[PDB]
Enzyme design. Sequence first.
Site, PDB file in Angstrom:
ATOM      1  N   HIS G  60      22.385  28.492  47.456  1.00  0.00           N
ATOM      2  CA  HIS G  60      21.656  29.260  46.458  1.00  0.00           C
ATOM      3  C   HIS G  60      21.330  30.648  46.993  1.00  0.00           C
ATOM      4  O   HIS G  60      21.748  31.663  46.428  1.00  0.00           O
ATOM      5  CB  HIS G  60      20.386  28.509  46.057  1.00  0.00           C
ATOM      6  CG  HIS G  60      19.568  29.217  45.027  1.00  0.00           C
ATOM      7  ND1 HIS G  60      20.099  29.669  43.840  1.00  0.00           N
ATOM      8  CD2 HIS G  60      18.256  29.549  45.002  1.00  0.00           C
ATOM      9  CE1 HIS G  60      19.151  30.250  43.128  1.00  0.00           C
ATOM     10  NE2 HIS G  60      18.024  30.188  43.810  1.00  0.00           N
ATOM     11  N   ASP G  90      38.428  59.893  38.728  1.00  0.00           N
ATOM     12  CA  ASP G  90      38.408  58.495  39.169  1.00  0.00           C
ATOM     13  C   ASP G  90      37.780  58.436  40.570  1.00  0.00           C
ATOM     14  O   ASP G  90      37.494  59.461  41.175  1.00  0.00           O
ATOM     15  CB  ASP G  90      39.811  57.890  39.153  1.00  0.00           C
ATOM     16  CG  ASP G  90      40.767  58.565  40.145  1.00  0.00           C
ATOM     17  OD1 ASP G  90      40.449  59.673  40.628  1.00  0.00           O
ATOM     18  OD2 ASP G  90      41.881  58.042  40.358  1.00  0.00           O
ATOM     19  N   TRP G 125      19.651  30.251  54.412  1.00  0.00           N
ATOM     20  CA  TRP G 125      20.506  31.422  54.279  1.00  0.00           C
ATOM     21  C   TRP G 125      20.339  32.383  55.443  1.00  0.00           C
ATOM     22  O   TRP G 125      21.143  33.309  55.586  1.00  0.00           O
ATOM     23  CB  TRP G 125      20.232  32.150  52.958  1.00  0.00           C
ATOM     24  CG  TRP G 125      19.135  33.170  53.012  1.00  0.00           C
ATOM     25  CD1 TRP G 125      17.806  32.950  52.822  1.00  0.00           C
ATOM     26  CD2 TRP G 125      19.277  34.576  53.254  1.00  0.00           C
ATOM     27  NE1 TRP G 125      17.109  34.125  52.938  1.00  0.00           N
ATOM     28  CE2 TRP G 125      17.989  35.139  53.204  1.00  0.00           C
ATOM     29  CE3 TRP G 125      20.366  35.411  53.514  1.00  0.00           C
ATOM     30  CZ2 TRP G 125      17.762  36.497  53.403  1.00  0.00           C
ATOM     31  CZ3 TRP G 125      20.136  36.758  53.710  1.00  0.00           C
ATOM     32  CH2 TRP G 125      18.845  37.288  53.654  1.00  0.00           C
ATOM     33  N   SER G 152      34.277  43.787  52.601  1.00  0.00           N
ATOM     34  CA  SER G 152      34.272  44.387  51.273  1.00  0.00           C
ATOM     35  C   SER G 152      33.108  45.353  51.114  1.00  0.00           C
ATOM     36  O   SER G 152      33.262  46.436  50.538  1.00  0.00           O
ATOM     37  CB  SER G 152      34.211  43.296  50.205  1.00  0.00           C
ATOM     38  OG  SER G 152      33.042  42.513  50.347  1.00  0.00           O
ATOM     39  N   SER G 153      31.932  44.978  51.614  1.00  0.00           N
ATOM     40  CA  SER G 153      30.764  45.837  51.472  1.00  0.00           C
ATOM     41  C   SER G 153      30.959  47.164  52.195  1.00  0.00           C
ATOM     42  O   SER G 153      30.620  48.224  51.658  1.00  0.00           O
ATOM     43  CB  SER G 153      29.522  45.118  51.994  1.00  0.00           C
ATOM     44  OG  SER G 153      29.677  44.762  53.356  1.00  0.00           O
ATOM     45  N   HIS G 228      16.340  43.087  56.493  1.00  0.00           N
ATOM     46  CA  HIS G 228      15.449  43.829  55.620  1.00  0.00           C
ATOM     47  C   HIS G 228      16.159  45.025  54.996  1.00  0.00           C
ATOM     48  O   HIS G 228      15.966  45.304  53.811  1.00  0.00           O
ATOM     49  CB  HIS G 228      14.208  44.267  56.378  1.00  0.00           C
ATOM     50  CG  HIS G 228      13.197  44.945  55.521  1.00  0.00           C
ATOM     51  ND1 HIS G 228      12.301  44.251  54.738  1.00  0.00           N
ATOM     52  CD2 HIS G 228      12.921  46.255  55.341  1.00  0.00           C
ATOM     53  CE1 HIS G 228      11.524  45.106  54.102  1.00  0.00           C
ATOM     54  NE2 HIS G 228      11.859  46.326  54.476  1.00  0.00           N
ATOM     55  N   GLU G 230      18.952  44.958  53.969  1.00  0.00           N
ATOM     56  CA  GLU G 230      19.658  44.324  52.862  1.00  0.00           C
ATOM     57  C   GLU G 230      18.791  44.260  51.609  1.00  0.00           C
ATOM     58  O   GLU G 230      19.275  44.520  50.504  1.00  0.00           O
ATOM     59  CB  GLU G 230      20.117  42.927  53.279  1.00  0.00           C
ATOM     60  CG  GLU G 230      20.789  42.117  52.190  1.00  0.00           C
ATOM     61  CD  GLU G 230      22.090  42.731  51.720  1.00  0.00           C
ATOM     62  OE1 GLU G 230      22.636  43.594  52.438  1.00  0.00           O
ATOM     63  OE2 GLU G 230      22.567  42.350  50.631  1.00  0.00           O
ATOM     64  N   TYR G 232      16.567  46.251  50.665  1.00  0.00           N
ATOM     65  CA  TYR G 232      16.549  47.568  50.041  1.00  0.00           C
ATOM     66  C   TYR G 232      17.922  48.034  49.598  1.00  0.00           C
ATOM     67  O   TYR G 232      18.014  48.869  48.696  1.00  0.00           O
ATOM     68  CB  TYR G 232      15.945  48.615  50.974  1.00  0.00           C
ATOM     69  CG  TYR G 232      14.481  48.398  51.163  1.00  0.00           C
ATOM     70  CD1 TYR G 232      13.560  48.759  50.189  1.00  0.00           C
ATOM     71  CD2 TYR G 232      14.020  47.799  52.296  1.00  0.00           C
ATOM     72  CE1 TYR G 232      12.210  48.532  50.373  1.00  0.00           C
ATOM     73  CE2 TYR G 232      12.715  47.587  52.470  1.00  0.00           C
ATOM     74  CZ  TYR G 232      11.801  47.936  51.534  1.00  0.00           C
ATOM     75  OH  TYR G 232      10.478  47.673  51.803  1.00  0.00           O
ATOM     76  N   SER G 243      15.630  54.834  36.640  1.00  0.00           N
ATOM     77  CA  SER G 243      15.401  56.254  36.403  1.00  0.00           C
ATOM     78  C   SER G 243      16.233  56.762  35.233  1.00  0.00           C
ATOM     79  O   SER G 243      15.728  57.502  34.381  1.00  0.00           O
ATOM     80  CB  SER G 243      15.715  57.049  37.669  1.00  0.00           C
ATOM     81  OG  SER G 243      17.064  56.876  38.057  1.00  0.00           O
ATOM     82  N   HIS G 277       8.712  42.319  60.690  1.00  0.00           N
ATOM     83  CA  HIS G 277       7.693  41.654  59.894  1.00  0.00           C
ATOM     84  C   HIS G 277       8.156  40.283  59.425  1.00  0.00           C
ATOM     85  O   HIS G 277       7.347  39.517  58.895  1.00  0.00           O
ATOM     86  CB  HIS G 277       7.270  42.537  58.709  1.00  0.00           C
ATOM     87  CG  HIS G 277       8.308  42.683  57.637  1.00  0.00           C
ATOM     88  ND1 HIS G 277       8.795  41.613  56.919  1.00  0.00           N
ATOM     89  CD2 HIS G 277       8.933  43.779  57.141  1.00  0.00           C
ATOM     90  CE1 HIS G 277       9.678  42.039  56.036  1.00  0.00           C
ATOM     91  NE2 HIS G 277       9.791  43.349  56.158  1.00  0.00           N
ATOM     92  N   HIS G 278       9.435  39.964  59.613  1.00  0.00           N
ATOM     93  CA  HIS G 278       9.976  38.628  59.406  1.00  0.00           C
ATOM     94  C   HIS G 278       9.827  37.732  60.628  1.00  0.00           C
ATOM     95  O   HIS G 278      10.215  36.563  60.569  1.00  0.00           O
ATOM     96  CB  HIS G 278      11.458  38.718  59.029  1.00  0.00           C
ATOM     97  CG  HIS G 278      11.700  39.168  57.624  1.00  0.00           C
ATOM     98  ND1 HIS G 278      11.588  38.322  56.545  1.00  0.00           N
ATOM     99  CD2 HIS G 278      12.057  40.374  57.123  1.00  0.00           C
ATOM    100  CE1 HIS G 278      11.859  38.987  55.437  1.00  0.00           C
ATOM    101  NE2 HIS G 278      12.140  40.238  55.759  1.00  0.00           N
ATOM    102  N   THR G 303       7.371  54.159  47.977  1.00  0.00           N
ATOM    103  CA  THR G 303       7.613  53.249  46.865  1.00  0.00           C
ATOM    104  C   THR G 303       6.598  53.466  45.752  1.00  0.00           C
ATOM    105  O   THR G 303       6.932  53.352  44.567  1.00  0.00           O
ATOM    106  CB  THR G 303       7.579  51.806  47.366  1.00  0.00           C
ATOM    107  OG1 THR G 303       8.568  51.627  48.386  1.00  0.00           O
ATOM    108  CG2 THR G 303       7.851  50.837  46.243  1.00  0.00           C
ATOM    109  N   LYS G 306       7.440  56.613  43.482  1.00  0.00           N
ATOM    110  CA  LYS G 306       8.461  56.370  42.471  1.00  0.00           C
ATOM    111  C   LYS G 306       7.881  55.649  41.261  1.00  0.00           C
ATOM    112  O   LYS G 306       8.220  55.972  40.117  1.00  0.00           O
ATOM    113  CB  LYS G 306       9.615  55.565  43.071  1.00  0.00           C
ATOM    114  CG  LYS G 306      10.423  56.317  44.106  1.00  0.00           C
ATOM    115  CD  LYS G 306      11.799  55.700  44.304  1.00  0.00           C
ATOM    116  CE  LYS G 306      12.862  56.424  43.494  1.00  0.00           C
ATOM    117  NZ  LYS G 306      12.602  56.380  42.031  1.00  0.00           N
ATOM    118  N   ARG G 428       8.101  25.951  52.638  1.00  0.00           N
ATOM    119  CA  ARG G 428       9.393  26.207  52.018  1.00  0.00           C
ATOM    120  C   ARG G 428      10.448  25.240  52.552  1.00  0.00           C
ATOM    121  O   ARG G 428      10.218  24.481  53.498  1.00  0.00           O
ATOM    122  CB  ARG G 428       9.870  27.636  52.277  1.00  0.00           C
ATOM    123  CG  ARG G 428       8.980  28.738  51.766  1.00  0.00           C
ATOM    124  CD  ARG G 428       9.448  30.115  52.260  1.00  0.00           C
ATOM    125  NE  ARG G 428      10.897  30.278  52.209  1.00  0.00           N
ATOM    126  CZ  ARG G 428      11.539  31.406  52.489  1.00  0.00           C
ATOM    127  NH1 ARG G 428      10.889  32.524  52.767  1.00  0.00           N
ATOM    128  NH2 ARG G 428      12.867  31.413  52.483  1.00  0.00           N
TER     129      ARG G 428
END
Lengths: 226, 76, 103, 107, 65, 124, 459, 196
Positions: G60, G90, G125, G152-153, G228, G230, G232, G243, G277-278, G303, G306, G428
């Site tokens: 998941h 293109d 995960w 790919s990323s 982390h 990731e 963001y 926006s 912080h993790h 943050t 915005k 969890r």
Amino acid sequence: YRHWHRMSEDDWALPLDSMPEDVKTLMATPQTERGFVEDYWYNRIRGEATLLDPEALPSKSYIALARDMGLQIVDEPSSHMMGLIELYEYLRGASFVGPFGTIENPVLVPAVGQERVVACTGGVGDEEHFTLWFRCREGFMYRCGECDQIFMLVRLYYEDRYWTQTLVRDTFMSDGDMFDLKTLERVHKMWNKDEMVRWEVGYWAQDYVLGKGVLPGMVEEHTRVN
Amino acid sequence: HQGTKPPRPVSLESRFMNQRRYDFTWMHPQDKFCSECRPVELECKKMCFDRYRSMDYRMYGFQRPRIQTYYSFSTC
Amino acid sequence: GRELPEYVVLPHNQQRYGRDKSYSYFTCLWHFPKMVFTEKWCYTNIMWFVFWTGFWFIPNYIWWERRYAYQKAGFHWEHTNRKLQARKEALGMDKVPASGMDW
Amino acid sequence: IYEGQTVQESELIPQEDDWVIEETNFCLGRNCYVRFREEDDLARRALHQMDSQLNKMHTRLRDGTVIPYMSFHPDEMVDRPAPIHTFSEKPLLKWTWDETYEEAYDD
Amino acid sequence: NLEDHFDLAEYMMKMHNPMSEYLYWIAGFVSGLHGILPLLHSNYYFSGMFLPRDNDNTQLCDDSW
Amino acid sequence: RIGGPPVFMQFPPPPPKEYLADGTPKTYPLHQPVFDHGYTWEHWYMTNAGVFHTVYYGEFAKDFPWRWGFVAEKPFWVGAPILVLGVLCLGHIIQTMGQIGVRPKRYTPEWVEATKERERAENT
Amino acid sequence: FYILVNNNKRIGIYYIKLSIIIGILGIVLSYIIRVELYNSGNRIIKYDNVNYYNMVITLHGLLMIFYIIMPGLYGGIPLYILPILSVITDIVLPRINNISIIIVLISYIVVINSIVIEYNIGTGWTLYPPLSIIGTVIVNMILYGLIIIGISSIISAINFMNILIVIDGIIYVYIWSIIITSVLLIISLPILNGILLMILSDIYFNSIYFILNGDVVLYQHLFWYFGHPEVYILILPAFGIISIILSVLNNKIIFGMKSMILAIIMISILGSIVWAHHIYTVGLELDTKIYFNNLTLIISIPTGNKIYNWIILYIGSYNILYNGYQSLIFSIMFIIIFIIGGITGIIISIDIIDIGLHDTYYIVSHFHYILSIGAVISLLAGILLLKDIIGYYNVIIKINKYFGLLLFININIIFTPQFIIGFNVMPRRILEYSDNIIVWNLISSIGSISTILILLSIF
Amino acid sequence: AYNGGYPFHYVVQYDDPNYDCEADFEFEEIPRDEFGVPAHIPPELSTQIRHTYYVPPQYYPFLKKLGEDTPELKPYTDKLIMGDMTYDDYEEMFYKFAKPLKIYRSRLPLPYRTDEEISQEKYVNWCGRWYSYRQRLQGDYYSRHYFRDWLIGVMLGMYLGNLCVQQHRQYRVDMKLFYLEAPEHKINWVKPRGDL
Ligand SMILES: CCCCCCCCCCCCCCCCCC(=O)OC[C@H](COP(=O)([O-])OCC(O)COP(=O)([O-])OC[C@@H](COC(=O)CCCCCCCCCCCCCCCCC)OC(=O)CCCCCCCCCCCCCCCCC)OC(=O)CCCCCCCCCCCCCCCCC
Ligand code: HEA
Ligand code: HEA
Ligand SMILES: [O-][O-]
Ligand SMILES: [Cu+2]
Ligand SMILES: [K+]
Ligand SMILES: [Zn+2]
């Protein structure tokens, strides 16, 4: 232009092996019926024939001299078209900055089709606003909804064709007196004698008029191995 | 220098030395040659190849004396 | 350069296509299976895919099954060892020359 | 920050006492899903779609100039749905400055 | 050509064959099955049942059913 | 650049139109159904048509299946509250079907009392 | 053709299509989890098959993060509009764009095939060792998928960076959002690859990094140094969409464009330096904990700027315009929902509060409110805005107030109770739990079944 | 000042008429430059040597005619006649007489507008100015209204927050009395259960 890559060797001159072998018909073809390669060699053969005849240059008018070299005498119609062509090409890889557009002098938006996407950024300084994109279609005097800047589309269209240097030359240049092959032969003997060729293009051109392989060393010049 | 590298003391098997969770087979996933030997542990492989040869299975290497071969860099 | 007419009159008089008929939420439940089992282009593409996928699956399957059975019987050297013990029993010799070598 | 174009009082003076603000409707019209005819084929339905583009519409003012459909971003300038090749002629972002050169003028 | 102006012209002009949509939904349905089928298979493999009965791993009353 | 990909090309004319043998124009598949039901409502919405324009977008009942024509006809605050409760009730019903008659022993009164005894002893 | 197409807009459609397909598998797994957690006992997973639950939660998480939301917000909408926003014909790298989507599909097939063929076990995960390295081959297959996805990323990130060289207009805020995510990927992915290779070395090459005298906490540093950034990389594209939607639909120019852009840049730099912080409960040094806690709280400043700049975009907009469009509702809902997720993030940022709330369902609800609600709704809102340009139909979404209301209500029924059980406390990554936590778990489960039913009404 | 001074394209000459730099593999032929300088004379030295163009004298009358018809061109033609024109002098002549193409706005067809419409231009401009005046004033008006409203939100958020402050305040008072007075607090009460 900055967007163009480096000059090719062909951009300066073409190899003599690209000269059409039927020179007799080449010099009799109308300009509208000559292709790019044929037109290059028509102008070079005729232009160099007049330039390599010093005794006749002082008595030749600029109108006749320009015709022989294949240069188009400029006029307001052709200047307008060429200028708008070069402005279109420049805008391909350059920014679009100019005076504020008004009804008297709209922003000129060159296009080949019937539409081009345009953005209005407003005036200078505090009068500049965020980009407002609109589709500029022909036949309408556009007004920005924010700053009231007037825009207009200019189409590079002539008789089912768009504007090109070739089109401008064909439409406005007029073929003069038919080129005389006697001049080619006369100049050929002037600069080419006793195994010295000081007009290589006229040695090849005279050889073709003679039928290809007639002049000394030309059979050996035309014999290739691959 | 490498051709005549001096022998070094046999390592005592310390608290965190020579830990294995599974046999060494990543080089030969299907054949599983020398599962107990490490990938470049030449002396372990030699004795392991000898077992295979004694079992009628041919293996290459570890049979010619160094001083009787060319390019050994171990000759006097 | 090709010359074409403004219109063409077809030989048949069948109005085969047109607007969709009104469909309900579960119309797909019967229409989709109908297409699979009744439209030729659908069931010829299915059979073609199944046949050739299975066709090339067989030779790989046969090869792996023989390989898998062999690998379960033992390692390569355990197999050669069993043939060596048999040859030693046939001759009654404790030590025999290795394969490919003479006495 | 942007606060609109600056106005001088002289520009707010009318030429007639009856001038008011023009009441032209900027609602383009009533629309819905583009409705294709059954008779039209793929080519003719493409023409139909190209003739229903809101971004090709405008409002004509009393003096004959038209205020076009405008957007903050060029995403709304391509045909809807987006064609395979969109900006063949490079879209021109017009910047304004006060610089000028003599060659452009004639006396 | 006019037919080539729009990407996926048949779908955008509403002429596409419905089978394309059916395949997309079927592909999603198969993707979903990858979470359910192995659940049933694994349950049977380690228990002998495809799915449990609620609270069958705990003590149940005599009349529980 | 002479002989390069043209900036602009005119569309060629469309292929010839097809008529049936009787002269009826040949129709082609069209996925714009006229759903059959009794609903005829028409909802209009002012929509952004760029920066300075709008468009009056209309949704017609016949463009939608029966289920949406029925739901979209009612006032939103009549349907919405009923739908919210209905969906929640259905979810609970679905999750109760697999536990009909399940009676764990730890929820019996005897076990409930024993936990109270443990809490008293442990001052929980 | 279909697979050979290089059109950047077609590939964008492929990314959205594949995200929905893979998303079906993701949602199904979520339904399994919530069904199981409906009461105490075994409901749909046997006690002898508890390893399957561990695999369900692991897949998941991995699928929703790397195969659904990331391909949808960083691959789908970006590949379709970015070259248009940049007024370029293109994408700069056509052939690379084609292979990227094919790579994503191939890695998805590997993962799901590993479900069917391999023994089903799970390690989260976050693939913490030593548990990840003592597992079966399914862990090896998952590692291959992640590495392949990483390829790919990174190539897609290279593709977007090249737009700076060709952009013919102005770099809008959305373009800035993608560029910065691309930078975050270029800097974070190479570190992830290294640590993943070390996991492989211990799994497959008899390495000893994650056995005694080797620090297992090392993995957590390198993993979360990507982890982390990731989160963001997954949210910044959503901000860019929000926006555009607010400015377009309200007919209002973005306020503080440069502050929006500089807020995105700031979030990236800060997000690249707050990963630990993790790792608050591992036992790090006091000064390290204080540094990370301090810098984590700083991220709220950019943050927050915005959020307030978005609010003023919606304020003052004309009343005559109809405000019930689904895209506008989703964009507004994002502000309301993101604030909840972010504030709870600041709560967990305090390490002493975190001691109580680490590895509890409070963390779950926190990142669900941002991703499962905020990111999903942002992707939906973005696709909805581009409905005319994309051209899809056969759905009733564009104007559907019932769908928005039901989704908002039911999604909150699922995750709001998960904040409560975080102080109950319910750990969890568990399936069985004490009988006194059933009420809240039951309420959330009722919410999950209901949300799924609402997904059927769109068709 | 580009490519290190190396011209992208340049002329090379060979003394042997049948020489081919690709087919032959001899090691005696020395290539020359466009001016004829042998390759073994370095550029730094050859570029200092002054090279001038020599046209056949039969061209002098033509070059004279050019100077007279265009007096600005005369100094360059005189240099060419006198054999004093270097390559740089030729370049200066070439670029001095290059002129830009001219565009005439009077030749552009205009979008169609009726004479009635053309007489309303001042009115439309007048409307546009009043729209900009009303826009600018409204910006100040709206900014004041909404930013002031945001204060109501601050005050509403300060009231609701203070409610939890009071609850927390009472909570701490209660906690201080638990271990001191609350009968719920029990000591010498819990006994070890022991192993089962
Ligand atoms: C999260 C969910 C909810 C989301 C809600 C919100 C959504 C918001 C909106 C989002 C919009 C996004 C953007 C959309 C853009 C659309 C653009 C578009 O339409 O492009 C055109 C594109 C193609 O149109 P085209 O241009 O006409 O294409 C022509 C073809 O190229 C050429 O035509 P052709 O006919 O020649 O085609 C070839 C055809 C030829 O086809 C045939 O011949 C078919 C024959 C019939 C076969 C039918 C299936 C049979 C299955 C049998 C199973 C048996 C099981 C037995 C079990 C027994 C057990 C005991 O196919 C093939 O040959 C290959 C097919 C391969 C694909 C299908 C794969 C299926 C699954 C396979 C699984 C395999 C597992 C193996 C495991 C092995 C393990 C060992 O459209 C599509 O592809 C369809 C798209 C449809 C949906 C569009 C979106 C609509 C809006 C959303 C709706 C909600 C969707 C929810 C998800 C799905 C839920 C399930
Ligand atoms: C896109 C998803 C996303 C986003 C944006 C965030 C954003 C933030 N997250 Fe994250 N987080 C996750 C996804 C996300 N997170 C996931 C998936 C995990 C768990 C992974 C796992 O453990 O397996 C996680 C875990 C996680 C933890 C671990 C808790 C634990 O392990 O016990 C912590 C604690 O530091 C944290 C903090 C934060 C902070 C401080 C922010 C900030 O970005 C929030 C900033 C936003 C605001 C603060 C609100 C808006 C700003 C204002 C309204 C201004 C005014 C506010 C203030 C002045 C405070 N997150
Ligand atoms: C973005 C990623 C994402 C998304 C969408 C979700 C969505 C959901 N998740 Fe999430 N979840 C995670 C990422 C995500 N989750 C992660 C990373 C973990 C931790 C993994 C671990 O513990 O190891 C986790 C853990 C997790 C658990 C904890 C199990 C455990 O470890 O004990 C639970 C159940 O309580 C749960 C439930 C749900 C539910 C009920 C939904 C949703 O179903 C809620 C309803 C919403 C929808 C059904 C809409 C979703 C639609 C799409 C995603 C498609 C969008 C596509 C387009 C718009 C084109 N999730
Ligand atoms: O992770 O925040
Ligand atoms: Cu984090
Ligand atoms: K349970
Ligand atoms: Zn303007």
